[PDB]
Amino acid sequence: VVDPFTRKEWFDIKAPSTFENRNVGKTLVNKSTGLKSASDALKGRVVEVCLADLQGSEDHSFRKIKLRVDEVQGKNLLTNFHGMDFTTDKLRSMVRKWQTLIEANVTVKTSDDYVLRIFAIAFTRKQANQVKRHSYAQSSHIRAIRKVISEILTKEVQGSTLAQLTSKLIPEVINKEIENATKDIFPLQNIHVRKVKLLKQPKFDVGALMALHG
Amino acid sequence: PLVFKLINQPRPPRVSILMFQREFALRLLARPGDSLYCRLSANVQMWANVTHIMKVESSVVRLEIKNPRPQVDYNEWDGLLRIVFVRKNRTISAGFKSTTVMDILEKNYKTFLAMNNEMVDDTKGSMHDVVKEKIDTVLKETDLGDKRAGKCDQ
């Protein structure tokens, strides 16, 4: 009988201060009667948006970024980093039938006490002088590149915290380090970290999250 | 269930003339060492005396219910012959601890000890007891377990 549209209350979320365009997203809570229940309802909310729409670039640069809401500031919501992914059609186009695919994985504890998982993908190029219609790589080559990706990813995430991880995700510094550090092993193409998982969340802080907002 | 309708009715008749399919008539007249042997063979061979006349493919078979009915409960005997006849080629010990057979059997046992009030231990069968091993003890206690379903008599 009663309409929930008469009851529900229009809220709003905002990005942290790492990114450029803060004004994204408009969320919603059924009831404002119990504020603790509303706060616990928005605590488990994970908003997935495009990174390019979050960065305002008109080219939709195939990266979805998914973000977790934590704190309330008067119908406005603080939002924290949770993870990154691609669109699945990017992976469907992206896998070639005549090259060798490398998956590299590393288990990560961070400097800011997060537990993380990083999946990086590398490939095999044609050179500018090729006659071969296929460019496969030997297994010892593949093991060497996987060793190099594990070392670069491990030292890169250990030398930095979450804000620097996000600040090095956007200009593709990490795969540039891969490109010039693996150029002595094999020619590599189309390198990106595909997908970011949080695994452990530490003891909940307050001032660090508004410092990320500030 | 074709012979089940005329095995347990009140006021049993004099004779029973009927035509069925011939292979069920082989199941009512199956020797215990056969692959044609089944549960319904035992059901007729100690509840309903039966022989084959008038081969017709179909078969006529003649049934007579024993008016001194032997005091055997049909539910427990039917259930045990079902759970050892479905696993005909298997043996009997490991076949009872199946997945859900090993729930419904001790449900039947707990209703069986509901009027007995036997204390169910914390030892209960995963190592040496009534859900797992005392079943093996009581099939060792009788003529079953190692002798398969195509060898055990009444």
């Binding site: 008109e58 939709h60 059609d89 186009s93 | -």
Partner: protein, 181 residues
């Protein structure tokens, strides 16, 4: 009040894209009144609209459907049929989704849906008002639901390993009470 969609260009079809693009764009630009921009480097096609164009919001979805059609092997006469009609839609399906086949079993299933000189493929386009393109492991049928539904029944007969003669008999049966009604 602009709107742009982004779509992916296969590598197997970019050479007929640059071969017959001169026949692709002016019918949709003239009759359907849209704007197209390429990105040949990043395999992307920009289908954009403008308030200086005609107000027709569904034909932008239709134009993305034409390039989604051309993504999956489809010629230009089926693009003319997709221009003129609305009941005609697109489908993919996998060889492994009916029956788990491997290698030469997959090759013989592709041979069964293909046939000698494509004749069972010809028999399934002409009798059902469908259009057939075979990928490595994908089957593609255009059309309406009464048409593509009996196309489904035929192709899951054929990829199950039923002989093509029973396919022809059931095909002319369903075509007979198709054109009967």
């Amino acid at each position: 009040k602009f709107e742009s969609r982004k779509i992916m260009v296969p590598p197997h079809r970019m050479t007929p894209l640059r071969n017959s693009w001169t026949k692709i764009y002016p019918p949709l630009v003239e009759h359907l009144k849209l704007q197209v921009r390429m990105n040949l480097k990043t395999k992307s096609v920009e289908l954009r609209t403008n308030p200086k164009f005609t107000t027709d919001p569904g034909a932008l979805q239709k134009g993305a459907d034409f390039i989604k059609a051309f993504t999956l092997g489809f010629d230009l006469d089926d693009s003319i049929a997709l221009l003129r009609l609305d009941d005609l839609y697109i489908e993919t399906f996998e060889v492994k989704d009916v029956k788990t086949l491997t290698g030469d079993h997959l090759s013989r299933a592709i041979g069964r849906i293909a046939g000698k000189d494509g004749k069972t493929k010809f028999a399934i386009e002409n009798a059902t008002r469908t259009r057939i393109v075979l990928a490595d492991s994908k089957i593609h049928i255009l059309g309406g639901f009464t048409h593509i539904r009996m196309a489904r029944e035929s192709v899951v007969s054929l990829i199950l390993g039923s002989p093509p003669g029973k396919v022809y008999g059931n095909l002319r049966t369903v075509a007979s009470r198709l054109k009967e009604r």
